[model samples]
Target: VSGTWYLKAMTVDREFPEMNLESVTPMTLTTLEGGNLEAKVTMLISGRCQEVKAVLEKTDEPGKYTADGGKHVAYIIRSHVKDHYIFYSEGELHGKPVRGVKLVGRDPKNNLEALEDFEKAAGARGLSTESILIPRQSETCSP
Candidate 1:
């Protein structure tokens, strides 16, 4: 998760209940010291909000992560492709499950498969989701 990517779309349990597809934003990931991961998440909703600098530390087992930077631990369900990752974030937004099936690519339009995969993964779990196609600005998440 250490690259510039289109936050093509995302679904939440509460608080952040919806997404604007026409104005989707970008997210960047960088590896810090001691194997900690920092994700610079840029969201276009409500006056360019979101300054999420994370350090998702890997567990002893593969695909499992420890919670950091206000986010809960994450689980890797499967890898549909090299860039297409289907994962689930646990213990977020009032202890509800926030599943994320995102595409790790440059362009969002050409990543139809990514969108489909995300929807398919999220749909199987439940309905409360969003669709975003538009591109937006980015952040470095410096603190």
Candidate 2:
């Protein structure tokens, strides 16, 4: 889960958008010493690439953290198990609530079955997502 993973598609709150996220691995989520956190993620914002980095500390609750990246303060929920990693990113886009789910695979190479399964999981989590995104069959991964 610390390496390149496929970005299937992202869905916002109001307007639904499902796009191709081929060969994109922009961040590696990890915990620092003293129980601090540091991570970043890359995305396509209206056809433009934007990267958001934040240092979040552990809260009283587990599997949750609040981040401040100057421009935005985000509530992040993370789970990296069960063959899929979920990054529930919440922030503000143009003064509106911006929420998205990054459904990435552990190793989704021709594993269409698992891909669809994960998408279904995200949908149950409240994303009105598309059906499937079939990537090209290739051994080489995206960086």
Candidate 3:
């Protein structure tokens, strides 16, 4: 629980079909004794391309509040793409290995609600809950 936690998955970005191809990436979460969480995510692409990094800050709610207050976790991800300048992204923590359409949104609140729904669905399917972290970006969704 105090070491690095990693998860890998395939993702696609419709905006950039060529570069947005399905790729496998690893996300690492580091937990401290005082309820502090630090995470680093790297997306490994083919060839010698650069990797993207996401520095995250995590905090658990006062109570064992399921997925309701999960969005309070925050993250700031910086992407460094050669020839394309660096970009910064900020968002809240949803947990690890987030799946389904419920947790797929731009707004943190909406994202949380979506995650709740997703959890419900997963429970019905006898699947374990996976934590998801959603980053909020300007010109997109807000908390």
How do all models score by TM-score? 0.65, 0.57, 0.31
Cα lDDT, model 2, residue 42: 66
Stretches off by above 4 angstroms in model 3 are: 21-27, 32-34, 46-48, 59-143
Tens-digit lDDT track of model 3 for 1-143: 33332231112222333432123233344655555544444433333333444333443533111223344333222112111111122223233333221122221233333344445544543443433333222221112
For model 1, where is the 10-residue window of minimal lDDT? 134-143
Off by over 4 Å in 2: 1-6, 12-23, 43-49, 69-83, 108-110, 129-143
lDDT (Cα, 0-100) at 36 in candidate 1 = 68
lDDT of 2 by residue, 89-138 (tens): 56665666666665555565444554455565567667655444443323
lDDT of 1 by residue, 1-143 (tens): 56876554556434345533324446677888877667666544544555556667878878778775547877655545446565566656545545444444544444666667767767775643554332543433221
Better of 1 and 2 by lDDT: 1
Task: lDDT for model 2, please.
Answer: 0.52
Who is ahead in TM-score, 1 or 2? 1
> Each model's C-alpha lDDT?
0.57, 0.52, 0.31
**Model 2 vs. true fold: TM:** 0.57
For TM-score, candidate 2 versus 3, the one ahead is 2
* TM-score sort, best first: 1, 2, 3
- Residue 33 error for model 1, in Å? 2.9
